[PDB]
Structure 1
Amino acid sequence: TGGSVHSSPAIGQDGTIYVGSNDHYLYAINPNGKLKWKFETGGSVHSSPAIGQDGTIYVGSNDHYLYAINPNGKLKWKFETGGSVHSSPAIGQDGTIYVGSNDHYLYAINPNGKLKWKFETGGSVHSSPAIGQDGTIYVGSNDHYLYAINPNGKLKWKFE
């Protein structure tokens, strides 16, 4: 790519490999190593993509947006947070997309790109969320806590 690849790749059902690059693009690479397409964001893509059931590719960007990209490389939507999105998204069973932001919030975004809820931690959320079998969302914060957040966006507990 044109820059450091710190983003961690994700693999689609047809074998397409998606990865972000410091050069600001989300890349879609065919299994044979040739470019399928590249999608330009406004900043470094350190966030690692996640792939929804319908093939939508979600990734954060240093330009403060969470991107939802169709398998053809055209934008589905982008959601603006208050700060760099270095956290990597996780997708719930109903399609909700969860991601942390440098602006200290954990975001829950509906598949349509509208905010479901946002939960304020005390510091940047660089950690990438994990979703439990019951739907609990776990994520670390720069504020030293591991958070457990219920599906409705309320604190379950925080572990110092």
Structure 2
Amino acid sequence: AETVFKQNHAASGFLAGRYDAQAMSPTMFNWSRESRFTSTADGALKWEKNVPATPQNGAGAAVDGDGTVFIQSKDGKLTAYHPDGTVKWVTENLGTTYTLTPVLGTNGVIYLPSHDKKLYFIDKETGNILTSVPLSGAPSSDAAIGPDGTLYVSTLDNYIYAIKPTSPSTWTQKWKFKTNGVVGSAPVLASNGTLYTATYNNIFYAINSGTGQVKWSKTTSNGFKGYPVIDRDGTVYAGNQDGNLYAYTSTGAVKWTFPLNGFSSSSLAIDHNGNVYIGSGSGELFSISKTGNMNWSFYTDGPVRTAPLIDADGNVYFGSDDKNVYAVDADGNEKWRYQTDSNVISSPVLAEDGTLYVGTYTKLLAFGAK
């Protein structure tokens, strides 16, 4: 890519970690989700592929510096597509049933937690397995990557694991944290070193990412779900199943809450002006200011489960259980929609040339530049 991938812009505060900086889109979460790319995509479909998947919390494709598109399917395949939709490679017999983002790290390594209770290290050039890490339970998050390359995942047996790769073929366990409750809020990391996660026992955790010790915790009446975003102040914005977005300061004070009219249904984005974006079971996609006032909302006919993606012009792309892909401008006005035949739940991704990828339970869709 001609410019480097950065997790942060001037208004976000993720802990900078060892993602592939030459990739177009190396991670779905643990970053602002404001793309550095512009797009002239107008809703015309460039191509579609059959990719059966059940992505956890809006997981989906990653795109490297060549524009190669990597995506897991629930038949146990990881597939690398060329930009024109032809297949570059396929690796089989990985996990089934639920899918996760094939996150692109340094040294051309793909980090793919898998439902077979393994965290695979995979060569992105060939798809060959470099090694795998046994997990005590099936993973429930994408791999977040820290500054020293440590991988942070939640697992379904109520753990956060910190696994440190020591080369493309070797690894050691940094720490593990047994959580009180099923993890619904996947690990994301903030610039002061804190890892944030939360459970359906209503506990929101701030954890020292180096040591695995809890710095502080807060409680609510229902569980947080998905991937929070973090601003430059270290404030964490997390969607709650009680129907509110919560903003926690870096000390654990409640900065504010905002009503979503339904259970939170997507993970978040944050733009360089500090506005945060989230989908609701109400069908709405919200834009909310850093002080917690509504900028706008856009109404779809079903829960919005894609984490929205902002482009460099402030347009916002997302999908709905009403089976439409959506594009709106920075003021919330519709640009275009595209009707597909499956709920749109696999979050959007932007290539350097403006191609937009987004997925359903059955297909990967590519929307081309105009």
The TM tier, using the shorter chain, reads over 0.9
1:108 and 2:287 correspond: yes
- 1:62 Cα deviation (Å)? 0.3
- 1:11 Cα deviation (Å)? 0.7
Distance 2:318 2:180 in 1: 31
| Alignment counterpart, residue 14 of structure 1, candidates 186, 192, 199 | 192
Q: Mean Cα displacement is larger for which, 20-29 or 64-73?
A: 20-29
Query: Is the CA contact 1:20–1:48 (under 8 Å) kept in the aligned structure 2?
Result: no
How many equivalent residue pairs?
A: 160
| Alignment counterpart, residue 78 of structure 1, candidates 246, 250, 257 | 257
SS in 1 for 2:185: coil
Q: Which residue of 1 aligns with 2:272?
A: 93
Q: Which residue of 1 aligns with 2:306?
A: 127
Distance 1:14 1:50 in 2: 14
Q: Which residue of 2 aligns with 1:44?
A: 223
Distance 1:58 1:117 in 2: 17
Choose between structure 1 and 2 for higher RCO, CA contacts under 8 A separated by at least 6 residues. 2
Distance 1:149 1:29 in 2: 36
Query: Is the CA contact 2:256–2:292 (under 8 Å) kept in the aligned structure 1?
Result: yes
Q: Mean Cα displacement is larger for which, 99-108 or 123-132?
A: 123-132
Q: Mean Cα displacement is larger for which, 121-130 or 58-67?
A: 121-130
The letter for the 2-side match of 1:3 is: G
Q: TM-score, normalized by length of structure 2? A: 0.42
Q: Mean Cα displacement is larger for which, 104-113 or 2-11?
A: 2-11
Q: TM-score, normalized by length of structure 1? A: 0.95
Distance 1:101 1:45 in 2: 13
User: 5+ unaligned residues in a row in structure 2: which ranges?
Assistant: 1-178, 340-370
Distance 2:318 2:218 in 1: 27
Q: Mean Cα displacement is larger for which, 124-133 or 96-105?
A: 124-133
Percent of aligned pairs with the same amino acid:
38
- 1:6 Cα deviation (Å)? 3.3
Correspondence list, 1:117-156, <5 A: 117-156=296-335
Structure 1 stretches of 4+ moved >2 Å: none
1:61 and 2:240 correspond: yes
- 1:86 Cα deviation (Å)? 3.0
Query: Is the CA contact 1:25–1:40 (under 8 Å) kept in the aligned structure 2?
Result: yes
The alignment yields a C-alpha RMSD, in angstroms, of 1.1
- 1:8 Cα deviation (Å)? 1.9
Query: Is the CA contact 2:265–2:303 (under 8 Å) kept in the aligned structure 1?
Result: no
Distance 1:142 1:63 in 2: 20
User: 5+ unaligned residues in a row in structure 1: which ranges?
Assistant: none
Q: Which residue of 1 aligns with 2:98?
A: none
Q: Mean Cα displacement is larger for which, 141-150 or 1-10?
A: 1-10
Distance 1:156 1:24 in 2: 38
Distance 2:281 2:268 in 1: 14
Q: Which residue of 1 aligns with 2:159?
A: none
Query: Is the CA contact 1:20–1:47 (under 8 Å) kept in the aligned structure 2?
Result: no
Distance 2:193 2:301 in 1: 39
Distance 2:338 2:279 in 1: 17
Quick check: which has more Rg, 1 or 2? 2
- 1:122 Cα deviation (Å)? 1.1
The letter for the 2-side match of 1:16 is: T
